[PDB]
């Protein structure tokens with residue numbers, strides 16, 4: 404496809420390895436670039452953890468309003484919300500909101516712990532049919548993206564399918580699916596990533612991520628005008644450990660998709 408040649412050219416000029424999956428829910432067609440290669444997830448795994456806690460809340464009444472103690476030992480690499488609550492509490496809803504909308508790493512670690520560790524997040528992935536996602540570590544090590552290391556990786560194909568199931572399908576209950584979509588739509592970190600490659604009138608929920616090896620990621624559900632929603636995942640990582648983040652490459656991938664399909 405013309406899209407696949409533009410994505411190959413984008414990668415060639417990019418200084419890294421690019422992975423893209425787009426699902427068009429109008430006809431359930433898929434466009435993939437390196438769609439079955441593993442990529443480090445970095446912050447984008449926060450969507451799985453928040454979703455897994457939402458699933459817990461379907462049978463545990465008021466779980467989202469349960470206070471969770473924030474302790475000094477919980478603070479990790481980026482704690483914009485939790486660092487205002489040490490020796491206080493945050494509810495699981497507030498922790499999910501902080502992880503998703505501010506990428507709060509302490510909040511992520513509280514969610515992972517609420518699920519019984521990284522295996523609990525992975526078990527939720529398996530329960531909703533994702534055989535590929537794996538979470539192996541916790542913050543701050545989730546931000547380390549060693550090339551070839553399969554820990555804390557997924558494939559673009561699998562993340563797009565899972566994101567679709569969570570936000571547009573039936574993986575979650577109706578109230579929970581709406582809450583996840585609301586959280587994603589209120590993300591504060593995405594202005595320079597997929598959103599920067601889309602028409603401003605299209606509605607977007609997204610979760611970015613970044614880590615070392617210049618790893619720069621974003622996963623999005625898009626509601627265009629005039630057509631059915633899209634699910635777009637863009638993963639990018641580079642050969643040098645201290646490579647610079649390339650949110651602009653993800654914006655380019657989003658523009659190719661927005662204009663070519």
Ligand SMILES: [Cl-]
Nearest residue numbers: 445446545546
């Ligand atoms: Cl992370």
Ligand SMILES: [Zn+2]
Nearest residue numbers: 508542545546
């Ligand atoms: Zn992190």
